[PDB]
Amino acid sequence: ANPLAGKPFYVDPASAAMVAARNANPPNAELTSVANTPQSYWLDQAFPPATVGGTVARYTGAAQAAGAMPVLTLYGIPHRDCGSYASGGFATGTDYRGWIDAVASGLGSSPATIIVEPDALAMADCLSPDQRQERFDLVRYAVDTLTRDPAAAVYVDAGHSRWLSAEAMAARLNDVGVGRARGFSLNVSNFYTTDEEIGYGEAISGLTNGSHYVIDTSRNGAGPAPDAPLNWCNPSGRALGAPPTTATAGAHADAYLWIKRPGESDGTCGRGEPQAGRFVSQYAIDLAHNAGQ
Ligand SMILES: CO[C@@H]1O[C@H](CO)[C@@H](O[C@@H]2O[C@H](CO)[C@@H](S[C@@H]3O[C@H](CO)[C@@H](O[C@@H]4O[C@H](CO)[C@@H](O)[C@H](O)[C@H]4O)[C@H](O)[C@H]3O)[C@H](O)[C@H]2O)[C@H](O)[C@H]1O
């Protein structure tokens, strides 16, 4: 059955959006709307192996106390973002493996939804063949280790419908053992329509023995900006998409989620915009305004 049905997704009471919504004077409807929508909590190399277990146990335990499903995004892969606007990640594969062990220690047997490494499989071609195989081994390590929590619903990130082909991405998912996980994620931090991503997801599902998937609908209410380089990097005219739900329109779509947090910058984007991940109230307000809120 769908592991994501049956309780609400957790609203992070300390998100940057919630801090902005509480500080707004006077109160701002757009920030309040975004703040009260469940998103995902992103972890990276800022949370070292030595302590990330406690961070994860705290978050999953808080979600359980709220009667809710936490969604965690792991974004620590070595050579993260191929050294671009969201550069980061752990220095070596050894470090990353230790990090994954620690995350799993903190999960225990607790309910969680885990989005494994946005962009890692899709962007792997920037790496040399040996670095690419290393990366695939690290993603496989994450799948094999994280799924030891029976209550973790694990989705390996698989890019989007305008990145790799369904066949190319299914090959990579099969190589990292997607069969052991619940499935894969699409559209993370991007803007493609839900309908387009369902078609792509169903294709990949067919090529991975019926795996299930989630779609990031955080910013896809108006579809993508016109085809141009960097059209994914803080584009204007985008809108919040469908709020998180398991009432989806795809046979193997477990949920629409907000994986990317609306309002966070995608990067400097060749325009001196805020560093990747920094919350910008104006960005959240514009996304909500464009959705008619
Ligand atoms: C001169 O060299 C050529 O440059 C052009 C333009 O840069 C290259 O073409 C672009 O190739 C891309 C494949 O690498 C694709 S798909 C496009 O890929 C980028 C990554 O390169 C993706 O960006 C990432 O998007 C994520 C969100 O979905 C972010 O989280 C992440 O930080 C981004 O880096 C993007 O989503 C994909 O759509 C282009 O369509 C193409 O224009 C060309 O290959 C070079 O030879």
Short mmCIF file of C-alpha atoms and ligand atoms in Angstrom, two decimals:
data_model
loop_
_atom_site.label_atom_id
_atom_site.label_comp_id
_atom_site.label_asym_id
_atom_site.label_seq_id
_atom_site.Cartn_x
_atom_site.Cartn_y
_atom_site.Cartn_z
CA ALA A 1 0.00 0.00 0.00
CA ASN A 2 1.03 3.68 -0.22
CA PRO A 3 3.31 4.32 2.80
CA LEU A 4 2.51 8.06 2.62
CA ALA A 5 -1.27 7.81 3.07
CA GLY A 6 -2.78 7.81 6.55
CA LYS A 7 -1.15 10.81 8.19
CA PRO A 8 -0.51 14.41 7.38
CA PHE A 9 2.93 15.55 6.32
CA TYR A 10 4.86 17.40 9.05
CA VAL A 11 4.88 21.19 9.09
CA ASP A 12 8.30 22.37 10.37
CA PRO A 13 7.44 24.93 13.09
CA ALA A 14 10.93 26.55 12.79
CA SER A 15 11.28 26.93 9.03
CA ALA A 16 12.62 30.19 7.68
CA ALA A 17 9.16 30.68 6.16
CA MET A 18 7.52 30.32 9.59
CA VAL A 19 10.04 32.75 11.12
CA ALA A 20 9.24 35.25 8.33
CA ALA A 21 5.47 34.74 8.69
CA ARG A 22 5.62 35.34 12.45
CA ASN A 23 7.80 38.46 12.03
CA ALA A 24 5.72 40.00 9.24
CA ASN A 25 4.26 43.35 10.35
CA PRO A 26 1.52 43.49 9.43
CA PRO A 27 0.80 39.75 8.93
CA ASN A 28 1.30 38.64 5.33
CA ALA A 29 -1.14 36.14 3.82
CA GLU A 30 1.36 34.77 1.32
CA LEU A 31 4.05 34.02 3.90
CA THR A 32 1.54 32.51 6.28
CA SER A 33 0.25 30.19 3.48
CA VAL A 34 3.74 28.94 2.62
CA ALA A 35 4.74 28.60 6.30
CA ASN A 36 1.78 26.37 7.13
CA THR A 37 2.39 23.97 4.18
CA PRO A 38 4.51 20.89 4.92
CA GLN A 39 7.83 20.85 3.02
CA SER A 40 10.99 18.73 3.49
CA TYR A 41 13.96 19.24 5.80
CA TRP A 42 17.27 19.29 3.92
CA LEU A 43 20.43 17.80 5.46
CA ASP A 44 23.98 18.16 4.19
CA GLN A 45 27.61 18.43 5.26
CA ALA A 46 26.68 21.14 7.78
CA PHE A 47 25.41 18.19 9.90
CA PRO A 48 28.48 16.00 10.44
CA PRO A 49 28.40 12.19 10.90
CA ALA A 50 29.23 12.68 14.56
CA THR A 51 25.97 14.48 15.32
CA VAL A 52 23.48 14.08 12.46
CA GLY A 53 21.94 11.01 14.11
CA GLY A 54 20.71 13.16 16.96
CA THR A 55 19.41 15.77 14.53
CA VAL A 56 17.45 13.13 12.62
CA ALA A 57 16.12 11.44 15.77
CA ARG A 58 14.93 14.86 17.05
CA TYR A 59 13.14 15.71 13.81
CA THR A 60 11.48 12.31 13.29
CA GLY A 61 10.52 12.19 16.96
CA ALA A 62 8.97 15.68 16.76
CA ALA A 63 6.99 14.65 13.70
CA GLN A 64 5.75 11.53 15.52
CA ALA A 65 4.71 13.70 18.47
CA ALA A 66 2.64 15.77 15.99
CA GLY A 67 1.02 12.65 14.51
CA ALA A 68 2.70 13.43 11.21
CA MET A 69 5.06 12.02 8.53
CA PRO A 70 8.43 13.82 8.38
CA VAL A 71 10.08 14.33 4.98
CA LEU A 72 13.87 14.56 4.96
CA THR A 73 16.04 15.39 1.94
CA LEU A 74 19.61 14.12 1.91
CA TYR A 75 21.87 16.47 -0.07
CA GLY A 76 25.46 15.59 0.90
CA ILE A 77 26.89 13.73 -2.14
CA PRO A 78 30.56 14.39 -2.89
CA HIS A 79 31.01 16.87 -5.78
CA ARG A 80 27.49 18.16 -5.05
CA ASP A 81 26.06 20.19 -7.91
CA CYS A 82 29.28 19.58 -9.88
CA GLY A 83 30.78 22.67 -8.22
CA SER A 84 28.04 25.05 -9.40
CA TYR A 85 25.72 27.37 -7.39
CA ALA A 86 24.85 24.68 -4.86
CA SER A 87 28.42 23.34 -4.48
CA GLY A 88 29.05 21.41 -1.28
CA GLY A 89 28.67 17.87 -0.02
CA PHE A 90 31.14 15.71 1.81
CA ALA A 91 34.75 15.60 0.68
CA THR A 92 35.03 11.84 0.08
CA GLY A 93 32.97 8.71 -0.27
CA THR A 94 34.27 7.44 3.08
CA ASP A 95 32.88 10.54 4.77
CA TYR A 96 29.56 10.20 2.95
CA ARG A 97 29.20 6.58 3.99
CA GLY A 98 29.79 7.47 7.61
CA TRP A 99 27.16 10.18 7.29
CA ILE A 100 24.60 7.73 5.88
CA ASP A 101 25.36 5.31 8.78
CA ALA A 102 24.68 8.10 11.23
CA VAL A 103 21.45 9.18 9.53
CA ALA A 104 20.24 5.54 9.67
CA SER A 105 21.19 5.32 13.35
CA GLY A 106 19.02 8.32 14.02
CA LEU A 107 16.07 6.95 12.03
CA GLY A 108 15.94 3.70 14.04
CA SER A 109 12.52 2.22 13.31
CA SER A 110 10.74 5.58 13.08
CA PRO A 111 8.43 6.66 10.24
CA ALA A 112 10.11 8.93 7.69
CA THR A 113 10.02 9.82 4.02
CA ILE A 114 13.56 10.18 2.63
CA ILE A 115 14.44 11.91 -0.63
CA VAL A 116 17.94 10.63 -1.54
CA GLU A 117 20.27 13.11 -3.25
CA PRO A 118 18.42 15.49 -5.56
CA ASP A 119 20.29 15.72 -8.91
CA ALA A 120 22.97 13.15 -8.09
CA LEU A 121 22.04 10.46 -10.62
CA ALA A 122 20.86 12.98 -13.26
CA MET A 123 23.98 15.18 -13.04
CA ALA A 124 26.48 12.31 -12.79
CA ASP A 125 27.70 12.76 -16.36
CA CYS A 126 29.73 15.84 -15.25
CA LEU A 127 32.01 13.36 -13.45
CA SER A 128 34.74 11.15 -14.86
CA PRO A 129 33.68 7.51 -15.44
CA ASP A 130 35.39 6.40 -12.18
CA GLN A 131 33.88 9.26 -10.15
CA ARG A 132 30.50 8.42 -11.70
CA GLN A 133 30.72 4.79 -10.58
CA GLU A 134 31.76 5.93 -7.13
CA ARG A 135 28.67 8.18 -7.00
CA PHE A 136 26.39 5.32 -8.07
CA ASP A 137 27.98 3.16 -5.32
CA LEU A 138 27.28 5.88 -2.73
CA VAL A 139 23.64 6.20 -3.76
CA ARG A 140 23.31 2.41 -3.63
CA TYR A 141 24.91 2.49 -0.15
CA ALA A 142 22.27 5.00 0.96
CA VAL A 143 19.45 2.80 -0.33
CA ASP A 144 20.87 -0.35 1.26
CA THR A 145 21.46 1.34 4.64
CA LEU A 146 18.43 3.58 4.98
CA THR A 147 15.92 0.82 4.11
CA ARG A 148 16.99 -1.08 7.22
CA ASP A 149 14.43 1.23 8.89
CA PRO A 150 11.28 -0.66 7.85
CA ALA A 151 9.26 2.53 8.37
CA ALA A 152 11.38 4.66 6.03
CA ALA A 153 9.78 5.32 2.65
CA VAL A 154 12.85 5.91 0.49
CA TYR A 155 12.73 7.71 -2.87
CA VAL A 156 15.92 8.02 -4.92
CA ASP A 157 16.03 11.24 -6.86
CA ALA A 158 15.62 10.78 -10.61
CA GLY A 159 15.78 14.29 -12.14
CA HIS A 160 12.88 15.39 -14.34
CA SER A 161 11.17 14.88 -17.67
CA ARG A 162 13.54 17.28 -19.56
CA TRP A 163 16.81 15.98 -18.11
CA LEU A 164 17.76 12.32 -18.81
CA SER A 165 15.52 10.04 -20.79
CA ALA A 166 13.24 7.59 -18.97
CA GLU A 167 15.42 4.75 -20.27
CA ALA A 168 18.68 6.37 -19.18
CA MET A 169 17.37 7.22 -15.70
CA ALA A 170 15.72 3.81 -15.22
CA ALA A 171 19.10 2.19 -15.94
CA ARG A 172 20.74 4.26 -13.21
CA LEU A 173 17.90 3.60 -10.73
CA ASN A 174 18.13 -0.13 -11.42
CA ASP A 175 21.89 0.00 -10.82
CA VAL A 176 21.50 1.62 -7.38
CA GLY A 177 18.84 -0.89 -6.34
CA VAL A 178 15.66 1.19 -6.59
CA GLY A 179 13.84 -2.15 -6.13
CA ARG A 180 14.84 -2.15 -2.46
CA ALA A 181 13.47 1.39 -1.99
CA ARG A 182 9.87 2.58 -2.48
CA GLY A 183 10.91 4.32 -5.68
CA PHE A 184 12.08 7.66 -6.95
CA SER A 185 11.47 11.44 -6.93
CA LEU A 186 10.87 13.87 -9.77
CA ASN A 187 10.90 17.63 -10.35
CA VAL A 188 12.85 18.47 -7.20
CA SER A 189 13.54 22.20 -7.21
CA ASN A 190 12.14 22.49 -10.73
CA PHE A 191 8.99 23.76 -12.37
CA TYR A 192 7.62 21.21 -14.85
CA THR A 193 3.88 20.52 -14.80
CA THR A 194 2.51 17.68 -12.73
CA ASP A 195 0.96 16.11 -15.81
CA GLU A 196 4.26 16.04 -17.65
CA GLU A 197 6.00 14.49 -14.63
CA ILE A 198 3.29 11.79 -14.24
CA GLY A 199 3.85 10.70 -17.82
CA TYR A 200 7.60 10.51 -17.19
CA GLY A 201 7.14 8.78 -13.83
CA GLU A 202 4.84 6.14 -15.24
CA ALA A 203 7.43 5.45 -17.97
CA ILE A 204 10.21 5.04 -15.43
CA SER A 205 7.93 2.92 -13.23
CA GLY A 206 7.44 0.56 -16.19
CA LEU A 207 11.22 0.23 -16.61
CA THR A 208 11.88 -0.39 -12.88
CA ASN A 209 9.43 -3.22 -12.18
CA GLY A 210 6.61 -0.99 -10.97
CA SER A 211 8.41 1.37 -8.63
CA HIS A 212 6.47 4.28 -7.16
CA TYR A 213 7.34 7.98 -7.16
CA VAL A 214 6.73 11.40 -5.72
CA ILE A 215 6.61 14.73 -7.59
CA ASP A 216 7.86 18.10 -6.15
CA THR A 217 4.94 20.46 -6.75
CA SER A 218 6.38 23.33 -4.71
CA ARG A 219 6.82 25.71 -7.66
CA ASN A 220 5.05 24.15 -10.68
CA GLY A 221 1.61 25.78 -10.65
CA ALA A 222 2.38 27.81 -13.79
CA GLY A 223 4.72 25.29 -15.38
CA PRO A 224 8.29 26.12 -16.41
CA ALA A 225 9.80 29.41 -17.63
CA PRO A 226 10.61 29.51 -21.36
CA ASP A 227 13.40 27.20 -22.52
CA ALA A 228 16.68 29.05 -21.85
CA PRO A 229 19.90 28.36 -19.95
CA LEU A 230 19.38 28.90 -16.21
CA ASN A 231 15.58 28.82 -16.59
CA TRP A 232 15.59 26.72 -13.36
CA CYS A 233 17.66 29.34 -11.46
CA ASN A 234 15.31 31.73 -9.61
CA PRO A 235 12.94 32.26 -12.60
CA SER A 236 10.24 34.86 -12.40
CA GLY A 237 6.56 34.23 -13.14
CA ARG A 238 6.40 30.82 -11.43
CA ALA A 239 3.64 29.83 -9.00
CA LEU A 240 3.19 27.50 -6.08
CA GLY A 241 1.80 24.17 -7.23
CA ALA A 242 -0.63 21.72 -5.62
CA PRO A 243 -0.25 21.43 -1.87
CA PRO A 244 1.18 18.14 -0.62
CA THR A 245 -1.26 15.24 -0.98
CA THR A 246 -1.61 11.55 -1.73
CA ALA A 247 -4.65 12.20 -3.96
CA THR A 248 -2.64 12.07 -7.17
CA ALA A 249 -3.43 11.53 -10.83
CA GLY A 250 -0.77 8.89 -11.51
CA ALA A 251 -1.18 5.16 -10.98
CA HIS A 252 2.23 4.88 -9.27
CA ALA A 253 2.42 8.46 -7.87
CA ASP A 254 2.41 8.06 -4.07
CA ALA A 255 2.31 11.82 -3.49
CA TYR A 256 2.75 15.38 -4.52
CA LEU A 257 5.27 16.87 -2.06
CA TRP A 258 6.93 20.22 -1.53
CA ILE A 259 10.55 19.06 -1.51
CA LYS A 260 12.19 22.35 -2.40
CA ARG A 261 11.21 25.02 0.15
CA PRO A 262 9.48 27.95 -1.63
CA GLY A 263 11.33 31.15 -0.96
CA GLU A 264 14.81 29.61 -0.86
CA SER A 265 17.18 30.95 -3.52
CA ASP A 266 18.40 28.54 -6.19
CA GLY A 267 21.76 30.36 -6.19
CA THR A 268 23.50 33.49 -7.39
CA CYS A 269 22.28 32.60 -10.91
CA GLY A 270 24.71 34.95 -12.72
CA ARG A 271 22.84 37.93 -11.28
CA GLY A 272 24.28 38.34 -7.78
CA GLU A 273 21.16 36.73 -6.22
CA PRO A 274 21.30 35.18 -2.72
CA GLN A 275 23.43 32.07 -2.08
CA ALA A 276 21.68 28.74 -2.75
CA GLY A 277 19.37 27.85 0.10
CA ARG A 278 19.00 31.29 1.64
CA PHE A 279 15.35 32.14 2.32
CA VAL A 280 14.08 35.24 0.54
CA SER A 281 10.66 36.43 1.71
CA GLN A 282 10.01 38.23 -1.60
CA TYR A 283 10.56 34.98 -3.52
CA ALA A 284 7.98 33.15 -1.36
CA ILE A 285 5.54 36.05 -1.69
CA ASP A 286 5.90 36.17 -5.49
CA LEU A 287 5.36 32.38 -5.83
CA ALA A 288 2.19 32.69 -3.69
CA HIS A 289 0.97 35.85 -5.48
CA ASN A 290 1.37 34.14 -8.84
CA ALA A 291 -0.76 31.26 -7.48
CA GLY A 292 -3.44 33.91 -6.77
CA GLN A 293 -2.79 34.03 -3.02
C1 LIG B 1 28.57 25.32 -23.87
O1 LIG B 1 28.33 24.09 -23.17
C2 LIG B 1 26.96 23.67 -23.25
O2 LIG B 1 26.18 24.45 -22.33
C3 LIG B 1 24.78 24.16 -22.49
C4 LIG B 1 23.97 25.15 -21.68
O3 LIG B 1 24.49 25.11 -20.36
C5 LIG B 1 24.52 22.70 -22.10
O4 LIG B 1 23.15 22.36 -22.28
C6 LIG B 1 22.39 22.05 -21.22
O5 LIG B 1 22.73 20.72 -20.88
C7 LIG B 1 21.95 20.24 -19.78
C8 LIG B 1 22.44 18.83 -19.43
O6 LIG B 1 23.56 18.97 -18.57
C9 LIG B 1 20.44 20.32 -20.11
S1 LIG B 1 19.28 19.51 -18.96
C10 LIG B 1 19.50 20.66 -17.58
O7 LIG B 1 20.67 20.26 -16.88
C11 LIG B 1 21.03 21.12 -15.85
C12 LIG B 1 22.37 20.65 -15.27
O8 LIG B 1 23.36 20.87 -16.26
C13 LIG B 1 19.91 21.04 -14.79
O9 LIG B 1 20.18 22.02 -13.85
C14 LIG B 1 20.00 21.62 -12.50
O10 LIG B 1 18.64 21.74 -12.19
C15 LIG B 1 18.36 21.29 -10.87
C16 LIG B 1 16.84 21.39 -10.71
O11 LIG B 1 16.18 20.54 -11.64
C17 LIG B 1 19.09 22.14 -9.81
O12 LIG B 1 18.81 21.63 -8.50
C18 LIG B 1 20.59 22.14 -10.13
O13 LIG B 1 21.30 22.98 -9.23
C19 LIG B 1 20.83 22.52 -11.58
O14 LIG B 1 22.23 22.50 -11.90
C20 LIG B 1 18.53 21.28 -15.41
O15 LIG B 1 17.47 21.03 -14.48
C21 LIG B 1 18.30 20.47 -16.66
O16 LIG B 1 17.09 20.89 -17.27
C22 LIG B 1 19.95 21.55 -20.81
O17 LIG B 1 18.64 21.43 -21.35
C23 LIG B 1 20.99 22.08 -21.79
O18 LIG B 1 20.57 23.36 -22.13
C24 LIG B 1 25.37 21.77 -22.95
O19 LIG B 1 25.28 20.42 -22.52
C25 LIG B 1 26.83 22.19 -22.92
O20 LIG B 1 27.47 21.36 -23.87
#
